Amino acid sequence: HMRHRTLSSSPALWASIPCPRSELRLDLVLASGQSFRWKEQSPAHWSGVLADQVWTLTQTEDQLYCTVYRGDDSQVSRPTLEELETLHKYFQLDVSLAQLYSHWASVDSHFQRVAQKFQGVRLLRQDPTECLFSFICSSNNNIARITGMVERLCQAFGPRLIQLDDVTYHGFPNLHALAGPEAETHLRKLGLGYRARYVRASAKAILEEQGGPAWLQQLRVAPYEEAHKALCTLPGVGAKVADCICLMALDKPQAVPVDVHVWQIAHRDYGWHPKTSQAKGPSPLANKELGNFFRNLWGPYAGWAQAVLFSADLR
Ligand SMILES: Cc1nc(C)c(-c2ccc(CC(=O)Nc3noc4c3CCCC4)cc2)[nH]1
């Protein structure tokens, strides 16, 4: 019935945002393990869902073209200003990535080499709910498997938005959908495994102990230190997952998630070791030290610099 759009197929439905390639490269951002809801359905065209709406995104050297599928049998048209403001805030284009890319590299000979090839890797401003349960699904996993777990989760529990070609799109579910007495067994069948317990338990915990999605908006305005400790009370959410949420959803640019991939990068590319801590390998105290090393090295936007290295280490 409906179909995925491209820029040549129907240019009347697209709207442009002025954006240099040095500020944003979609191919290095949308599938670099921040969001798991974007797929290149057509070449150079990234389709995905963003707060109960489907988008398709493409670009030139200095323009970010975008088109919206509103669904609900509505009148097909260009994106509105309010809708393009949502996209402008999603990519965080008010913040200059070029000035960050120069402030990093002043004290970082490694980033200087990496910034040449992988330019325009910016940090997305995601929904807290979507971000939280997506990174509970990330434990001991890869981008391919996580994308599957999140998609199947959204199909079962999330509301239906629109179908395009052979791809039925779903918005991310609310806390109440995941918190019920049937969700763990359902999510296990969908293939989350042990992660099914934490999805349900954290959803039930946020709703009953903390008081619903409003709590995540309190954590947004609350400081990084409090929000991190607060998230660590949740089932299946430790320092790593809390830092992912803090960085990508709660506007904490200094948050540095420490799993094993930063350990590999920090060790191989910076020659870092646990100096103060006696343990040679990963541990709560050593992971905390590694976050402080990168915060001291890069500054208050340390997590944004980490995202450039994560995108570079994948390719
Ligand atoms: C071989 C290989 N190298 C790497 C770096 C991966 C890899 C990448 C990404 C993910 C999903 C994930 O956890 N992403 C992030 N976690 O904290 C951050 C992110 C993205 C950037 C900001 C902070 C899992 C594995 N695989």
Author numbering: 10 to 324
What did the publication describing this PDB structure actually write?
Our approach is applied to discover inhibitors of 8-oxoguanine DNA glycosylase (OGG1), an enzyme that is part of the DNA damage response pathway. OGG1 recognizes the presence of the oxidized nucleobase 7,8-dihydro-8-oxoguanine (8-oxoG) in DNA and initiates repair by excision of the damaged base. Recent studies demonstrate that inhibition of OGG1 is a promising strategy for the development of drugs against cancer and inflammation. The active site is highly polar and adopts different shapes in the complexes with the inhibitor and DNA, which are properties characteristic of challenging drug targets.
As commercial chemical space lacked elaborations of our most potent inhibitor, further optimization was driven by reaction-based enumeration of virtual libraries using commercial building blocks. Reagents compatible with Chan-Lam, Suzuki, Ullmann, or amide couplings were identified and reacted in silico to afford molecules with similar topologies as compound 7. The resulting synthetically accessible virtual library contained 6720 molecules that were not available in make-on-demand catalogs. As the docking was performed to the active site conformation of OGG1 observed in the complex with inhibitor 7, several compounds were designed to extend into the additional subpocket identified in this structure. In total, 16 compounds (8-23) were successfully synthesized in-house and detailed synthetic procedures are provided in the Supplementary Information. As the docking algorithm did not take protein flexibility into account, access to multiple structures of OGG1 representing different active site conformations was crucial for successful fragment elaboration.
